[PDB]
Amino acid sequence: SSKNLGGKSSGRRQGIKKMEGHYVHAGNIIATQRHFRWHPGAHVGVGKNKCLYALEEGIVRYTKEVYVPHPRNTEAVDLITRLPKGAVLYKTFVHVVPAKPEGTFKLVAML
Amino acid sequence: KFTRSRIPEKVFQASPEDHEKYGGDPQNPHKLHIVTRIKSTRRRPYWEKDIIKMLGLEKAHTPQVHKNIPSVNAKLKVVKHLIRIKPLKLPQGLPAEENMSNTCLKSTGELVVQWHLKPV
Amino acid sequence: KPKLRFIERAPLVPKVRREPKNLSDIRGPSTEATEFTEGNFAILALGGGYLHWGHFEMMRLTINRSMDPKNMFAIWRVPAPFKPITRKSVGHRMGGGKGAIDHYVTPVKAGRLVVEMGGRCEFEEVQGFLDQVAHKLPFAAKAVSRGTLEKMRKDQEERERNNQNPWTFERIATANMLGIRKVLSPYDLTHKGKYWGKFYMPKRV
RNA sequence: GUUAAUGUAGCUUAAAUUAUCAAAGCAAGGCACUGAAAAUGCCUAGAUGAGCCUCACAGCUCCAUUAACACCA
RNA sequence: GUUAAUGUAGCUUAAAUUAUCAAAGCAAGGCACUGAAAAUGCCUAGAUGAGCCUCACAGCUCCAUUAACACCA
RNA sequence: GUUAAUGUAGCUUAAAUUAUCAAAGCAAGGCACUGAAAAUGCCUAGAUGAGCCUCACAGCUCCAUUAACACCA
RNA sequence: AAAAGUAGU
RNA sequence: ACCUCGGAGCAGAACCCAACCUCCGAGCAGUACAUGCUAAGACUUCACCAGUCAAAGCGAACCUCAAUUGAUCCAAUAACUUGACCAACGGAACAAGUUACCCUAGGGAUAACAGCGCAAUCCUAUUCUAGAGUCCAUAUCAACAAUAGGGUUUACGACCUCGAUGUUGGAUCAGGACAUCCCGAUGGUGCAGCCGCUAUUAAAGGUUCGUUUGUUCAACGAUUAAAGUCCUACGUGAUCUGAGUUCAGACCGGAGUAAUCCAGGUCGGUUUCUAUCUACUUUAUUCCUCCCUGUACGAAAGGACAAGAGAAAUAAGG
RNA sequence: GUACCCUAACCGUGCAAAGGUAGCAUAAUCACUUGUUCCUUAAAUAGGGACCUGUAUGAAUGGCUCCACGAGGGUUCAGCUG
RNA sequence: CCGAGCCUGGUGAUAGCUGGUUGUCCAAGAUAGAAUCUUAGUUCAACUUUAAAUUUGCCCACAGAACCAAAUCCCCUUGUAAAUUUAACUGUUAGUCCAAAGAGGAACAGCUCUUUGGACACUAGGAAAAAACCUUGUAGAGAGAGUAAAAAAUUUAACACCCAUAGUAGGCCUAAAAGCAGCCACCAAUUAAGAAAGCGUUCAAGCUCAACACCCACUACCUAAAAAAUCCCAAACAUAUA
Ligand SMILES: [Mg+2]
Ligand SMILES: [Mg+2]
Ligand SMILES: [Mg+2]
Ligand SMILES: [Mg+2]
Ligand SMILES: [Mg+2]
Ligand SMILES: [Mg+2]
Ligand SMILES: [Mg+2]
Ligand SMILES: [Mg+2]
Ligand SMILES: [Mg+2]
Ligand SMILES: [Mg+2]
Ligand SMILES: [Mg+2]
Ligand SMILES: [Mg+2]
Ligand SMILES: [Mg+2]
Ligand SMILES: [Mg+2]
Ligand SMILES: [Mg+2]
Ligand SMILES: [Mg+2]
Ligand SMILES: [Mg+2]
Ligand SMILES: [Mg+2]
Ligand SMILES: [Mg+2]
Ligand SMILES: [Mg+2]
Ligand SMILES: [Mg+2]
Ligand SMILES: [Mg+2]
Ligand SMILES: [Mg+2]
Ligand SMILES: [Mg+2]
Ligand SMILES: [Mg+2]
Ligand SMILES: [Mg+2]
Ligand SMILES: [Mg+2]
Ligand SMILES: [Mg+2]
Ligand SMILES: [Mg+2]
């Protein structure tokens, strides 16, 4: 018999790809997820599939920071207006502290 | 599952009644260890098989000196049942180079510096 | 109404999903009702085990047949049977899925009071039929009072002070002294060395 | 030697809870008299007992019985 | 034990969604009376429970009733 | 996956624009009631959006329904 | 064209 | 029954993780019409194939979702492109039954018999005191349950054997256990006596002949002191049987277009072996009759034990 | 579903090309199954004669009787024989 | 030897199938998975071997990794010496048990399936023999020595002695219910005996128990059965020093 079908998908390998303090480069995928786990913070973008890529070369840092959702994010601004007034929500975020500067100025011409 | 154990750090603080059972004083702790393997590395997990090959303890009942520093103690904490630790308690000084050619370990762990086999 | 109610077989919103048999519902000390709620004399469970509906009838008969409803009351402390048990039909080969929900059990851990009884009575009185029913229970059980039970725990915190056997099980498992966690459970770090499977050995610290 | 399934006013069926009717047989009803048909009443330990809530009403105690079986390959 | 089918007016039959026409049963009328026939009416919890939208209605959720299969030594 | 033919009073056909009739359907019309056969009346969105003028009537738009074929990796 | 029955002296 | 993809649990906290394990789903719909072009760096379904994300730039404005799918070769197309419930979903371009007439290669990697493991079903004993027993739990029976045991059944597992461990009943010869059917001894009785019911002990001795069926069984007839429960490769086929079952022939009913098939029946159907090795080859119960006597007992029908006498039957040895 | 044994002479309704007719029947005929009864036996899962749910009989897939015949397969009286 | 003769040829047919594979010696060496007319096989990955080039590799500490337990990941120090890439390949890709967390089944199996770790298919000592449990592994000679693991412990159930009058046939309803079918109150005499706790009665009666008195004094260890089938199975032993 065994009426239960379809239980045969594999694990998706969604996790952190770069732990805290790792030297990430511009474009590496920091973390991969569905159903938001780590939110993108400083110098971290987000994809279509909620993957977290780095945009600036540097060191990846993980913090806890205050959540303020976008006002056209209706699914969350309803969730904000049910808290009592002392409350905040505090999602965790992924940053990249940059390591190279933007550049130096070089003498090309004593002209 | 069976896995690597953390041991609580409660048990690696000696009682005031523990300093009378052995010969040590908590101020001025010793410099080096004598580490000797008394148990086999077989029927033990692979992590204990790797630690033993670092501490120079591949061979049973051969002593070894390792520093009494917490990076060595961490390796020694996870293999502390295969090994026997006594402090290397030097009665005389550290060996000078003219002196160093004739020393003995003297189990009771006393690195004596003059080893001539005439009786007292 | 001072009588044990009609606890029933197979509850009314039934369990269409067949739960896996987890045996962690039987191991170790209880976390649910281990202490009294407005009674005096009770049945202690000194072992894990399941309780069929044929086990509740032996309790609902021999208590209520031999308790006077003018002077004594009784309440259950166990819940209803809620955990479904699967039985494949007789004579079937292995494989082919999971069988139908046949009957229901309730899991009782060790150290849990199962039936509470009080009133204008004494413990030397109701030992006459609480010891009757605690032998028909499908685990090691014994009838306790409010005052007799706490005598036992006064000794159990005395056996952890009295003994000059210089090693306890708590000392060796936690410290991993002979490499003994190769042979020990994670759950016998946190139970103690007392429970072992379903069974409770009270005769050891 | 095994299980599941039945046990009814006298007979039958049922009502899948709260108990209906055709009969056997009671006497009104109407015809000269009777039959037939119609009006009722009766008569149900619901096969057996402690009911847990209350019980054909559900688990049993129980006394019969129909089936399936204990063959094999 | 497993597969597939099907649960309809008291009866059976269908309608590819809105449930007809044929009994039975109900009052009338023709006949002295009843039938047959002619004029009407009523009758399906469409077996089971929520609805994603509207469901005998289509997926199921359920209990009865039937088919064919329970083999090889 | 490509042609070709066709949609109508509820069902069959067609007349070269100007749309004919038999069923079905509603009536009386007649006898102690059912059916033909006559008949008046009644129901032709001529399948679709415009028209180049006046389109069953014609070059497109498709809504479909059926023929003749051709598709395997 | 279609009509079947009427309890026992 | 399933075959591919997805969510969730087992897999509790990086990643991963089976199952004919538990549950939900999917084989699309919707809006754009830049769903344009390029290009650093990474993720990855444990390989590959595939899938994923994306900074900057050129160019214009100023995607939701969980899966929602299909390689190559070939087709059709001028070209851009488009083709599979290729769903057995990494896809053979296009192919079903049947075989007891069967063959070959293997397999104890894999079933039947037998062993073994396990004991759910079976069997037994105790614990408990519900209830039967007019009263009265314990003379006998026993509910719900509990704790042990046994290894007789139906199973289940697939561990030894498929370069063969021959298979049911029966004959022959039996060995053993005791959970005793008889014979012996004893305690209780709801045991007056006779018969019995139950329990402890005892396994030296014994445990019938027939009709039917292949029958173990079972029904029956006639007895018996009684006509035991089981194990021993369901003891024993290099001791026998071949009736059934388990080949080739054949009807019959059914299934199927047929070939053929059926835990359906029925007639018929080859049972080989000259012994190398181990092992081995001469050591008493029971019934009935008489008697007690028609006593003991009972009110009477009924009716003993014990002692004693004697007869037979089997067994063993002549 | 009825008179009424709770069974169809009949009534009502569907599908079909036709609804298995005559015979025979617990068979060499799925099962129940050792059907039930009379005979045979001290005793009959055997055999013979009937009764019929054969719900899977049945008419040249031939049906049913019957004379002979059979190294066919069952039953049997009597004799006889280790 | 006919479900299609026989001989020769194709023919050394093909065989994911079985069998077999021949000198000496040393060295490294155990199986994550995915596809598959595939699960008796193969291709890739993994693991393994060799030859090379380079620089880090294991071990890890603070900090750090989500909302709706054991642990792991990342990781400097440090202990150590390996790792990665490059080049060439074959083989293994039909597993066993033990511990632990689980799933299926009977919370059955020397059962099946995953994970973590061992061990086994590697030698040796022990647990009686013994794959998988424990000790222990890098090799030879020795008629030297210290050790490692390493031999099961249990044997139970005595019990108070005496004495018992009485408002009572305690009110209700009951054929009758007198302490004892059931309700209600639980009053009371002498010192001391309950409006009565168990038998025994249709009911009454009869027995005890709880009571005075009696003394030495309640004397109070609170425990726990066994069954197979050829023939029990070391012999035995309580007493000279860790
Ligand atoms: Mg999953
Ligand atoms: Mg998977
Ligand atoms: Mg990858
Ligand atoms: Mg851009
Ligand atoms: Mg495929
Ligand atoms: Mg495939
Ligand atoms: Mg044949
Ligand atoms: Mg043939
Ligand atoms: Mg062969
Ligand atoms: Mg077997
Ligand atoms: Mg009684
Ligand atoms: Mg095997
Ligand atoms: Mg296996
Ligand atoms: Mg074999
Ligand atoms: Mg051989
Ligand atoms: Mg005995
Ligand atoms: Mg045999
Ligand atoms: Mg033999
Ligand atoms: Mg012959
Ligand atoms: Mg022979
Ligand atoms: Mg031999
Ligand atoms: Mg037959
Ligand atoms: Mg002839
Ligand atoms: Mg060859
Ligand atoms: Mg193969
Ligand atoms: Mg080597
Ligand atoms: Mg294959
Ligand atoms: Mg196994
Ligand atoms: Mg007296």
From Swiss-Prot, chain A:
One of its GO terms (molecular function) is structural constituent of ribosome. GO terms for biological process: mitochondrial translation; translation. One of its GO terms (cellular component) is mitochondrial inner membrane. Keywords: Mitochondrion, Ribonucleoprotein, Ribosomal protein, Transit peptide. It is found in: Mitochondrion. Coiled coil: none annotated. It comes from the Eukaryota. Belongs to the bacterial ribosomal protein bL27 family. Component of the mitochondrial large ribosomal subunit (mt-LSU). Mature mammalian 55S mitochondrial ribosomes consist of a small (28S) and a large (39S) subunit. The 28S small subunit contains a 12S ribosomal RNA (12S mt-rRNA) and 30 different proteins. The 39S large subunit contains a 16S rRNA (16S mt-rRNA), a copy of mitochondrial valine transfer RNA (mt-tRNA(Val)), which plays an integral structural role, and 52 different proteins. This is Large ribosomal subunit protein bL27m. It comes from Homo sapiens. The lineage of its organism: Eukaryota, Metazoa, Chordata, Craniata, Vertebrata. The chain holds residues 38 to 148 of 148 of the full protein.
From Swiss-Prot, chain B:
GO terms for molecular function: structural constituent of ribosome. It is found in: Mitochondrion. Its main location: mitochondrion. One of its GO terms (biological process) is mitochondrial translation. Keywords: Mitochondrion, Ribonucleoprotein, Ribosomal protein, Transit peptide. GO terms for cellular component: mitochondrial inner membrane; mitochondrial large ribosomal subunit; mitochondrion. Transmembrane segments: none annotated. Component of the mitochondrial large ribosomal subunit (mt-LSU). Mature mammalian 55S mitochondrial ribosomes consist of a small (28S) and a large (39S) subunit. The 28S small subunit contains a 12S ribosomal RNA (12S mt-rRNA) and 30 different proteins. The 39S large subunit contains a 16S rRNA (16S mt-rRNA), a copy of mitochondrial valine transfer RNA (mt-tRNA(Val)), which plays an integral structural role, and 52 different proteins. Belongs to the universal ribosomal protein uL30 family. This is Large ribosomal subunit protein uL30m. It comes from Homo sapiens (Human). The lineage of its organism: Eukaryota, Metazoa, Chordata, Craniata, Vertebrata. The gene is MRPL30. The chain holds residues 35 to 154 of 161 of the full protein.
From Swiss-Prot, chain C:
The lineage of its organism: Eukaryota, Metazoa, Chordata, Craniata, Vertebrata. One of its GO terms (biological process) is mitochondrial translation. Keywords: Mitochondrion, Ribonucleoprotein, Ribosomal protein, Transit peptide. One of its GO terms (molecular function) is rRNA binding. Belongs to the universal ribosomal protein uL16 family. This is Large ribosomal subunit protein uL16m. Its main location: mitochondrion. It is found in: Mitochondrion. Component of the mitochondrial large ribosomal subunit (mt-LSU). Mature mammalian 55S mitochondrial ribosomes consist of a small (28S) and a large (39S) subunit. The 28S small subunit contains a 12S ribosomal RNA (12S mt-rRNA) and 30 different proteins. The 39S large subunit contains a 16S rRNA (16S mt-rRNA), a copy of mitochondrial valine transfer RNA (mt-tRNA(Val)), which plays an integral structural role, and 52 different proteins. It comes from the Eukaryota. The gene is MRPL16. One of its GO terms (cellular component) is mitochondrial inner membrane.
